[PDB]
């Protein structure tokens, strides 16, 4: 099911953050002493309750090593109890320029994320995250021999059944073109595939996607949609990686590949 643990089973330790519908806490699980993260819930915008519920539904149906696991629920207030991932997030790690990630570790990271997404796309119906970017990838370990190096986190914006329209304004540098300016079949799983190409770009270069450019917001969106504007892949990138990224970021969603092709090409690098 989704199990309920309320208060006796859990012990709090600190506070590790704020951000979305409440307060996040570090804590631990008293029965076997696993360490966990605890997400709490704090009119018309008081329907972020709907957000909390949606995150629950999606998580309860996922069970994979490269996806953050939901342990249980707690009541009064409403809380989510999830595994705690020790080494921070990908976006912050890439910001340390003095200590670049080594090439073999970079490959693990790329593959580990691709496995997580492949699993999501194989569900019926397919699960779409909708907010994939570097701050949403959490790091379990940076040892090249660890069983797991990276995990997909924060299903704050996602859905089932391949449909949804344009919604809420976004950091457009990570999103597929059919999702930004409005469209109709927009938000299939193919949109996540475009976001994955940006994650590959960032891991490869250590840089933000589209940071080479400066445009006003309307102009930038039009360049990406109509002119095919993309980040520049460096000359020394291996050709096999260059191909995977270019296919993944195609303007036509139908040309973005299946994750079975993607995992195979990455394993050959
Ligand atoms: C959304 C949801 C979706 N799927 C399974 C669930 C199992 C238990 C509780 C919920 S839940 O509604 O999200 N939820 C928050 C409070 C509402 N009722 C009980 C529980 C505390 C589920
Ligand atoms: C789930 C989780 C799991 N493990 C470690 C964590 C460390 C910091 C923040 C979180 S976290 O709360 O999930 N989280 C995501 C929501 C945005 N604000 C808080 C931070 C980004 C962790």
């Amino acid at each position: 099911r989704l199990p309920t643990l309320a208060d006796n089973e859990i012990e709090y330790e600190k506070q590790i953050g704020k951000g979305g519908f409440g307060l996040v806490h570090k804590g631990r699980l008293v029965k076997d002493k696993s360490v966990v993260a605890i997400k709490s819930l704090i009119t018309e915008m008081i329907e972020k309750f709907q957000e909390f519920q949606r995150e629950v539904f999606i998580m309860s149906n996922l069970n994979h090593p490269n996806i953050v696991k939901l342990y249980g629920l707690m009541h009064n207030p409403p809380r989510m109890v999830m595994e705690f991932v020790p080494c921070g997030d990908l976006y912050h790690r890439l910001l340390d320029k003095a200590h670049p990630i080594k090439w073999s570790v970079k490959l693990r990271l790329m593959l580990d994320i691709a496995l997580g997404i492949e699993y999501m796309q194989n569900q019926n119906p397919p699960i779409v995250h909708r907010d994939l970017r570097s701050p949403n990838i959490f790091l379990q370990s940076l040892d090249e021999n660890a069983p797991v190096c990276a995990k997909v986190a924060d299903f704050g914006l996602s859905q089932q059944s391949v449909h949804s329209v344009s919604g809420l304004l976004g950091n457009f540098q990570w999103m597929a073109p059919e999702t930004i300016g409005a469209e109709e079949e927009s938000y299939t799983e193919k949109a996540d595939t475009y976001s994955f190409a940006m994650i590959l770009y960032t891991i490869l270069t250590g840089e933000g996607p589209f940071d080479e450019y400066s445009y006003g917001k309307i102009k930038f969106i039009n360049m990406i949609r109509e002119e095919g504007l993309r980040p520049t892949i460096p000359e020394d990138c291996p050709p096999r990686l260059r191909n995977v990224i270019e296919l993944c970021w195609s303007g036509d969603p139908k040309k973005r590949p299946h994750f079975s092709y993607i995992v195979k090409e990455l394993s050959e690098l």
Side-chain angles (χ1 to χ4, degrees), residues 3-269:
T4 297
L5 356 58
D7 284 59
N8 310 77
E9 36 253 333
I10 275 53
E11 3 270 87
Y12 286 62
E13 298 185 353
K14 318 52 145 327
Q15 166 157 341
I16 56 197
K18 116 148 139 276
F21 48 71
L23 264 31
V24 190
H25 281 40
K26 182 184 198 164
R28 148 146 23 207
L29 207 72
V30 25
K31 102 172 168 153
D32 79 7
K33 300 166 144 268
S34 271
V35 47
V36 304
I38 296 139
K39 277 171 82 173
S40 67
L41 189 74
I42 245 43
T43 59
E44 1 46 17
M45 173 71 165
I46 331 214
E47 290 8 339
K48 71 227 243 257
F49 189 45
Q50 284 178 30
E51 241 160 347
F52 174 98
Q53 289 191 120
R54 211 190 59 214
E55 182 161 350
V56 170
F57 173 67
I58 273 132
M59 326 272 284
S60 84
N61 45 66
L62 307 159
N63 184 38
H64 180 108
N66 304 116
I67 298 162
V68 170
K69 246 147 215 156
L70 166 77
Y71 301 145
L73 285 187
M74 273 184 151
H75 285 295
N76 285 306
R79 281 168 244 156
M80 280 187 252
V81 176
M82 41 217 19
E83 46 164 328
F84 177 85
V85 190
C87 301
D89 71 70
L90 173 74
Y91 166 89
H92 292 282
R93 181 54 186 91
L94 293 175
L95 256 21
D96 188 350
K97 305 293 159 89
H99 304 106
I101 301 175
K102 96 157 174 131
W103 175 251
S104 69
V105 175
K106 285 176 156 175
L107 302 165
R108 285 293 313 278
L109 263 12
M110 288 180 186
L111 271 164
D112 263 20
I113 299 155
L115 290 162
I117 305 165
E118 170 179 57
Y119 171 93
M120 283 149 76
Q121 294 185 9
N122 281 340
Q123 292 322 110
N124 328 94
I127 292 264
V128 176
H129 186 294
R130 258 154 151 127
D131 200 27
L132 289 170
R133 54 199 164 95
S134 63
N136 294 327
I137 311 298
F138 298 178
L139 321 163
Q140 189 65 43
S141 155
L142 297 164
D143 191 302
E144 53 174 308
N145 298 305
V148 177
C149 302
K151 274 129 128 93
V152 186
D154 257 58
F155 286 77
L157 278 220
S158 37
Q159 298 237 193
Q160 244 181 339
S161 222
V162 150
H163 313 321
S164 170
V165 309
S166 213
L168 30 193
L169 246 345
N171 28 240
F172 67 73
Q173 56 272 107
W174 300 94
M175 293 297 103
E178 78 268 13
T179 76
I180 38 210
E183 292 225 19
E184 77 280 347
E185 186 87 318
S186 124
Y187 285 118
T188 89
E189 88 275 358
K190 289 307 184 177
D192 275 6
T193 312
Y194 179 103
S195 296
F196 180 70
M198 303 304 160
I199 295 187
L200 296 182
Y201 174 86
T202 218
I203 290 155
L204 171 70
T205 69
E207 300 295 90
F210 297 102
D211 283 357
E212 77 199 275
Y213 316 113
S214 198
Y215 294 112
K217 159 156 152 273
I218 294 172
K219 174 64 162 160
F220 229 136
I221 290 172
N222 283 338
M223 290 292 277
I224 299 161
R225 279 181 164 270
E226 325 280 314
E227 297 322 305
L229 184 77
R230 304 281 179 285
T232 304
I233 300 170
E235 294 177 350
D236 64 333
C237 174
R240 207 156 187 159
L241 183 64
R242 177 154 45 233
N243 182 72
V244 161
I245 294 165
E246 289 174 331
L247 296 177
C248 287
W249 73 29
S250 295
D252 175 10
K254 272 75 226 248
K255 321 235 232 271
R256 313 182 194 142
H258 193 274
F259 269 89
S260 78
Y261 176 84
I262 289 157
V263 176
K264 180 83 216 285
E265 292 303 305
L266 295 171
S267 70
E268 298 292 336
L269 254 6

